Design a protein around this ligand. Structure first.
Ligand SMILES: [Mg+2]
Length: 261
């Protein structure tokens, strides 16, 4: 039976329409916490911009975090796994974005920066997602840092164009306007493996919840994958069960369906 739950944040815990966590989600996570389920966040965001989970954090309901798509995982104050991107590939992405005239965010362990932020950053990251303004640094400076994740605001055509230049990185999206790039193998599936290794939980005892392309590997990898009802068709197809949309009690209904609560 299920022992560990892995939740994506945007479109799975937090509504893109209200920017809040549905009340029935908070009630379901309280009831699962008291039943002894372990509750984990699994997000493409780095810790520095997780600014929308205080309801669950102040209720002490989260047992650990998979951040940066699995490239930085921690339980309490303890880092259990982290990675960095090959410097050649950080430099190639900085050069490609600078040439194309698009912004890119560069995330280090303890710093986050943005290069040449433009309308796509202001429109999507700040006006819509409500992320705090990230400090600007030049592409040259960023190209030289030890980077755990890059977030280029590139289209799918542009991503296919830069691909040859980031030969070993993973790339995926939780929103259509930008993509997150991590080192080889660092996906939320790797995150689930590191968190259950720490707790002695088997893969056959996990359940994941997601709405986006960057959740597909953890929807297929967990023993039971739950897609949100408003997710695109390929995310639904990677799941074992499609629940109601997020703002129609999707999380609570899924957890009640399985008997988690
Ligand atoms: Mg999402």
């Amino acid at each position: 039976m299920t022992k560990a739950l892995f939740f994506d944040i945007a479109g799975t815990l937090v509504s893109f329409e209200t920017h809040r966590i549905p009340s029935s989600t908070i009630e379901a996570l309280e009831a699962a916490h008291a039943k002894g389920l372990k509750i984990f966040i699994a997000t493409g965001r780095p810790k520095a911009i997780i600014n929308n989970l205080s309801e669950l954090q102040d209720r002490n309901l989260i047992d650990g975090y998979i951040t940066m798509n699995g490239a930085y995982c921690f339980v309490g104050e303890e880092v259990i796994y982290k990675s960095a991107i090959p410097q050649e590939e950080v430099k190639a992405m900085a050069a490609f974005c600078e040439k194309k005239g698009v912004p890119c965010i560069f995330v280090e362990e303890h710093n986050i920066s943005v290069c040449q932020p433009n309308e796509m950053v202001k429109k999507i990251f700040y006006d819509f997602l409500h992320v705090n303004v990230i400090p600007t640094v030049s592409f040259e400076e960023a190209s030289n840092k030890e980077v755990i994740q890059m977030t280029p605001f590139i289209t799918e055509e542009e991503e296919k164009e830069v691909l040859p230049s980031i030969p070993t990185c993973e790339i995926g999206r939780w929103y259509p306007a930008f993509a997150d790039v991590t080192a080889k193998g660092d996906t939320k599936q790797k995150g689930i493996d590191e968190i259950i290794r720490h707790f002695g939980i088997k893969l056959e005892e996990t359940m994941s919840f997601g709405d986006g392309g960057n959740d597909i590997s953890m929807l297929r990898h967990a023993a039971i994958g739950v897609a949100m009802g408003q997710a695109k068709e390929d995310v639904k197809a990677a799941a074992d069960y499609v629940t109601a949309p997020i703002d129609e009690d999707g999380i609570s209904k899924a957890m009640k369906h399985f008997g988690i609560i």
